[model samples]
Target: SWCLSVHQPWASLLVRGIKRVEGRSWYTPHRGRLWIAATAKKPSPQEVSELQATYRLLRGKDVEFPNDYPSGCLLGCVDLIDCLSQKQFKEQFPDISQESDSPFVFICKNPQEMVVKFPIKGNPKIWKLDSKIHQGAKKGLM
Candidate 1:
């Protein structure tokens, strides 16, 4: 029922289980399975370059970055198990913490890719998905 909007390569990376911690400026009490949606914003050249480097750092150079990142779509789902403070996050994932200074770190697990990417507009913070979309996602789970 709940969905979070993430930028391009990050969303893709999250679904593929490459990046497990999502950093945020704010914290959420909700912790459970939630949809991961890719935002429609086009990454700048710099952003793409950084993401590519991150891909190599996390996944290794042997694997290539995914090229098919559709906008405004639910890429998959992940379990938000824990919300850690910045200190705990840094201790848990020092490498990732160096990239962003978000005080709230969301630890995600059991990433599942959707069989079909459900397209939907996203808001700034956590948002609710349509029942039809949510049901469709559940049925299309891979």
Candidate 2:
């Protein structure tokens, strides 16, 4: 299992299954239960509002998310199925490409949110969870 530091509400959004295409400058073939750690930094009101609008546009009227989201904690995990280049992603997903940029795309699925948030500081890229906290995040998650 690997953990990635994602920005606040985006981490929540990804694990909650509202967002599907995650942008990255790097590429990873690594696929499986990739844990999502919300960064310590909080989101601006504008970021939250814009994201909600984006999800609403993508997910329809039923879309719902909390304005208050956790940070600097392990929020959840997602099955990272595959990675695609920006050109390929743009062509493949018009549904998501509407607001898209040309960072490499990671097409993720099967989001699983942890009920308990084990506090963990995050690295800039994919990394293993720390020893003690790994137990909490990995417990029953496998």
Candidate 3:
């Protein structure tokens, strides 16, 4: 298993791919063997639309340890664990995510240093959860 950190909008790629949809930052069909890390920021309507087309839309929280997430949103459309301790989560996840938030913590099986692993499952797409989880800024339409 592998722990992935997909930046917003881009992370939307996995979401769309896994869920087979267009947009929507929910985690589905990617839990268990694979551990994905994402952010919490509802991009501006335009940004969301742009990303939806660029990537896939995954549904539900089928991930684990979403750090450095944006906690504030006028629309209240943020991740479940908003106030995430990025620094701690980074190390913690790299070490052990089973006890971390998001629940799906068994993806740290194929770390680059597979020699000393925590004994999880398979190799998942580990992405670097970016700190730039933002909602951009609404454009037109009031």
Candidate 4:
């Protein structure tokens, strides 16, 4: 399955269903079910706090976040619906675009969290895992 290595806070946010738009400097042609993994780099207190605050403002309410931001672990997956350019994304999602300065936006939805986390190394670019892990993910999702 396709897996993307994302940084903390945002990575957890996406898996938990609070984040709708995943931004990147580049765009991917691949679309469909994609796995998410939190990068090993940790976030500072301010980074996490500020991001959560912004998310509350965007979401228009106080919401929950990951208690502990784990690194190098598979969090969950989401449906890769579509990808759009900055101009197109801004026009499509004005509210969300307010926080994103990304040149490209990945429109994602159907956020599903995996109860169990699999500790794994991450790659800068999107990568794929073995079929055994895919079956493991299936079991975790179920």
Candidate 5:
């Protein structure tokens, strides 16, 4: 499993983009995936400046959750497959937090199938595709 931990910093926005590259490497096809995670927690002066610079460089293509800015933190997950090249992915998502040692993870073809497979009252409720597996408050996530 690959995990990326992004801090809450105007990071007020979060977004991820994926692209595909053809004929780059022989072992792989012309496709790959990219993921981006962001937050919007108040950061120290130095941290704030750094994040602002990132926002500027990306040309404002980030996503917002409404809750991030007010509460001061937010998180998001994105995945794209058969739509990215290694070179392109690196260029767009540099700084390299957790670039996924295995490409399979980037695509996440099968994400465990279930995180809460058991039932609460002998009746299991299927997880929502749009819901995070863990719990959180109206604001802030742990």
Candidate 6:
């Protein structure tokens, strides 16, 4: 199985199915199920505010964002079906605006919360896990 590291609020947002597209600086050729791991770094106030604004705007209500964001662990998994250009992302997710330097937006679907958050240090790049781990993941980690 492959795991991708994402920063705080965004990671939770994605795993919770609040956001369906994750932006990347570059595109990935691998398209399939991948784990969503949250980084240990806490978000700056600006980042938190931005996420809250986006959530409030998209959800049409104030959100009680998680205070203790899960980190150093796998929150869930998503089906990374396609990578889209900025224009395509805008068209597909009109409610959420682009705010990062990323030009490629990964189109994710079938968001799922892990039955148990698997704690693991994350790699900056996509990395593989053992087959046994993958078996556990296939059972419901995704």
Which candidate should be chosen as best, given TM-score against the real structure?
4
lDDT (C-alpha) at residue 65 in model 2: 84
In the range 62-87, model 2's lDDT, one tens digit per residue, is 78786567889998889888778888
TM-score of each: 0.87, 0.88, 0.25, 0.93, 0.29, 0.79
Model 1: CA > 4 A from native:
44-46, 94-96
Residue-wise C-alpha lDDT for candidate 5, range 1-142, written one tens digit per residue: 1122234442123232221111222232322222222323345667655655665554444532232222222233333243344555565546541343333223322111121121111111111222342332111211
Positional deviation of residue 80's Cα in model 1 after best superposition, in angstroms: 0.6
Among these predictions, the greatest lDDT belongs to: 4
Model 2: CA > 4 A from native: 140-142
**How many backbone clashes does every candidate have?**
0, 0, 21, 0, 6, 0
- Which regions in candidate 6 have their CA more than 4 angstroms from the true location? 44-50, 62-68, 91-101
> Residue by residue across 6-109, what tens digits does model 1's lDDT show?
99878877887877788899989889997899999867768877877867876688765566767789999999998888998888877677655688888899
* Candidate 6 displacement at residue 130 in angstroms: 3.4
**Least lDDT summed over 10 consecutive residues: which range in candidate 4?**
93-102
Candidate numbers, best TM-score first, in rank order = 4, 2, 1, 6, 5, 3
Model 5 quality (TM-score)? 0.29
Clashing pairs in 6: none
lDDT of candidate 5 at residue 135, scale 0 to 100: 33
Give the winner by TM-score: 1 or 2: 2
Model 5: per-residue Cα lDDT at residue 48: 55
Which lDDT tens digits does candidate 6 get at residues 1-142? 8878998878988877777778887778879987888888877878877878878876767555555567777788889998878877777767564643368888888888776776777887677766775677677743
For all candidates in order, the CA lDDT equals 0.84, 0.82, 0.30, 0.87, 0.30, 0.77
What TM-score does prediction 6 earn? 0.79
